[PDB]
């Protein structure tokens, strides 16, 4: 049981995309748990825009490449364990490579990404999201902060 | 008292600061007994930025137990909209003296590194 990962990861991807106006085109999930991570996600990237940046602006991207750069970020993210800020932390990482990509004319890339965030997400991170309450504990957590807004 | 919400979440992303440093010199320890590479050099410097990310991640997430106990004074009546609002602006303020915290172990770590 929960949530399926894939439609989690391409939602998030296409709203990250679609409101950078590109259009993106590659058990069933609530629209409340979309709408909190999106929520949660801009939140995140507003506090740590400077750190993405300098992150972004560093960043030699190549088809073969892409892969071993995530992978050091995202194995670094979580050496030490899960929490729901890293979760946050690594889908806006995820949509970072996501953007750049469209923006260094290498779009094919953002399919590969969300592949990658989708398959780190089933195998790694699902069963502490299943342990700790699945999504609708995350929903339940940020809802107070959506409550300011 | 409305203020120990934002004192715990003080401490808290202090001491997370601190780990940091602490992760950051591990892995400058690790890079000195090793004679580098540019390769090398740049996995580490993007090792840094991640740690700094998770960093980031751990008390983004401090802020949004600071903000869910916060709801639950304002429901207790021990709390009001106002104050919660002036919450909501110290934790932001916080994240970012946090995260320029951050910035200057990371700088640190590379002239370090290189020099």
């Known amino acids: 049981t929960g949530y399926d990962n894939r439609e989690i990861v391409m939602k998030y991807i296409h709203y990250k995309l679609s409101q950078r106006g590109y259009e993106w085109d590659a058990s069933p999930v609530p629209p409340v748990v979309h709408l909190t991570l999106r929520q949660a996600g801009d939140d995140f990237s507003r506090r740590y825009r400077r750190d993405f940046a300098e992150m972004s602006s560093q960043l030699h991207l190549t088809p073969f490449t892409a892969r071993g750069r995530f992978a050091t970020v995202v194995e670094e993210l979580f050496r030490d364990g899960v929490n729901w800020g890293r979760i946050v932390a690594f889908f806006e990482f995820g949509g970072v490579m996501c953007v750049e990509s469209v923006n260094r004319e290498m779009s094919p890339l953002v399919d590969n990404i969300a592949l990658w965030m989708t398959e780190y997400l089933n195998r790694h991170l699902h069963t502490w999201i299943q342990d700790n309450g699945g999504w609708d504990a995350f929903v339940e957590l940020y809802g107070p902060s959506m409550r300011l807004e | ?115």
């Open chain 2, 1 to 115: 008292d409305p203020k120990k919400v934002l004192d715990k979440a003080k401490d808290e992303a202090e001491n997370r600061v601190r780990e940091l440093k602490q992760r950051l010199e591990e892995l400058y320890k690790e890079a000195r007994k090793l004679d580098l590479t540019q390769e090398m050099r740049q996995e580490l410097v993007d090792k840094a930025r991640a740690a700094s990310l998770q960093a980031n991640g751990d008390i983004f997430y401090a802020i949004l137990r600071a903000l869910a106990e916060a709801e639950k004074l304002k429901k207790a009546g021990l709390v009001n909209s106002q104050q919660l609002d002036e919450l909501k602006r110290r934790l932001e303020e916080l994240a970012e003296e946090a995260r320029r915290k951050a910035e200057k172990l990371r700088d640190e770590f590379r002239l370090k590194l290189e020099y």
